Amino acid sequence: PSSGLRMTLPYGLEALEPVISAATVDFHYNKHHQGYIQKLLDATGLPESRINLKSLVTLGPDRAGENVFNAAGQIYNHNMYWLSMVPTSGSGRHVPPRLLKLIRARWGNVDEMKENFMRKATALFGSGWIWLVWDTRERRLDLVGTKDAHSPLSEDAGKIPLFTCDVWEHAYYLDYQHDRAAYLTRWWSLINWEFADSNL
């Protein structure tokens, strides 16, 4: 699901309320997220059926071309993001024991984890993304920031993406304006911990 050009929203536009308004999901998904799709079609000139999304993201902005990469990267990223949140009446809010043991090993308990995430996620300067990753080189969880359209996948340095929080101002500005931390504290309550564990 997480791969693939044209991912359908796995839920309604208001299913993230009251953390992220219907208005925000509407613009984020139907404007930003779709815009990137056309954008990638226009920049490759390829038909949908010929585009391998992850392959472009790993290829990188140099080999793929800045604008092919920014588009593809943004699609992969936005894919991961919608998948990272549980709607109202979804499931996935509970931490599978497997992932839970790993997070306790890194940070002690989830409270400590949230606190490092808030620290790193508020400080990220500019347009970017926050990722929980599993570091394969080091066999441990970690929190990583990437800029613009970059990712653990495009950095291709052994870090496997588990979840992502969009930190571009378009992700929260309608709802929280300058107050990214307010957005972040509440986006935590949305995490699909199941999905995260499944990327292990």
Beta strands in the chain (DSSP E): 128-135, 140-147, 159-166
- Give whichever of 27 and 104 is closer to its own copies, judged by the CB atom: 27
- How many CA atoms are closer than 13 Å to the CA of 34, on its beta-carbon side? 9
Residue ranges in 139-158 that form contacts with its own copies under rule CB under 8 A: 147-149
Stretch that binds Fe ion, among 59-67, 123-131, 133-141, 159-167 (CB under 5 A): 159-167
C-alpha–C-alpha distance, residues 131 and 77, integer Å:
10
Determine whether the annotation assigns residue 28 to a binding site.
yes
Can you tell me the distance from the alpha carbon of 77 to that of 153, in angstroms, rounded to the nearest whole number? 10
33 annotated among ligand-binding-site residues:
no
Q: Does 126 bind its own copies (CB under 8 A)?
A: yes
**One residue of 4, 17, 27, 199 binding its own copies per CB under 8 A:** 27
Distance separating alpha carbons of residues 184 and 166, to the nearest angstrom: 10
Quote the least distance from Cβ 110 to Fe ion, whole Å. 25
Residue 169 sits at the vertex; the CA angle it makes with 128 and 36, to the nearest 5 degrees, is 70
Note the residues at the interface with its own copies (CB under 8 A). 27, 31-32, 35, 66, 70, 125-127, 147-149, 168-170, 173-174, 177-178
